[PDB]
Amino acid sequence: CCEHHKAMIAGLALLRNPELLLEIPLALLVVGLGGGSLPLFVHDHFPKSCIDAVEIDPSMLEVATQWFGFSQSDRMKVHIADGLDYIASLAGGGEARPCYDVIMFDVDSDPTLGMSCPPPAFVEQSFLQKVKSILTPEGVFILNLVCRDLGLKDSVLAGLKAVFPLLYVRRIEGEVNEILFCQLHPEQKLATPELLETAQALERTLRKPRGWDDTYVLSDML
């Protein structure tokens, strides 16, 4: 919906054939709910997506559920937790631990900190190792970054690249935010023409206007 959300969703083009993308299950972890529009968009446009959303503030979930059309279902669950704690627990799950195709950080907090979007702990290298441990090998880690301190920004970017050696960057028109798209295997990266092709294919489907709501039919039938 908003410009930085459209850019984050665009990162799904780094996964695989965008024809296939709608037609196959996709596991997505999203940290930071806001008004719910980002996970709601994915839920509504990708009928086989399974989303875990982590949100620190129960009031954000309350308002989104009461007034902004957000809801939980079998395919979209919200956990009230600090994303740092939540990812640390998931990463400690053993061979049982989850494996997400996509991890999105849309987290924005404390004015004290040297950056608030995300808080710096989310991009510290020992935490980034926990993120890597719950991502599929060919998955994508997508980060909304606001960092006006350019010295800090270079340190953040260097640390990200140390753990995710394939980095792409999108600056957003009319705002300071940039979206980082982080992957694990630079040798498998798409050539520029392929990069262009996959993006255009994704946007064609998401603009296409459709469907049937199959939820909660049993009450009416019985």
Residue numbers in the entry: 470 to 578, 580 to 679, 681 to 693
Quote the authors verbatim.
Here, we report the identification of human METTL13 as a dual MTase that targets both the N terminus and Lys55 of eEF1A through two distinct MTase domains, firmly establishing its function using a combination of in vitro and in vivo methods. METTL13 harbors two distinct predicted MTase domains that both belong to the 7BS superfamily. During elongation, eEF1A performs the essential function of delivering aminoacyl-tRNA to the ribosome, in a process where the ribosome samples the available pool of ternary aminoacyl-tRNA–eEF1A-GTP complexes.
Moreover, MT13-C and SpdS share a short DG-motif (Asp551-Gly552 in METTL13) localized after β-strand 3 and not generally found in other 7BS enzymes. The localization and orientation of the acidic aspartate residue in this motif allows hydrogen bonding to the primary amine of the adenosine moiety of AdoHcy and MTA, respectively. For SpdS, two aspartate residues (Asp173 and Asp176) in Post II have been shown to be important for both tetramethylenediamine (putrescine) substrate binding and efficient catalysis, and interestingly, MT13-C has an aspartate residue (Asp575) at the position corresponding to Asp173.
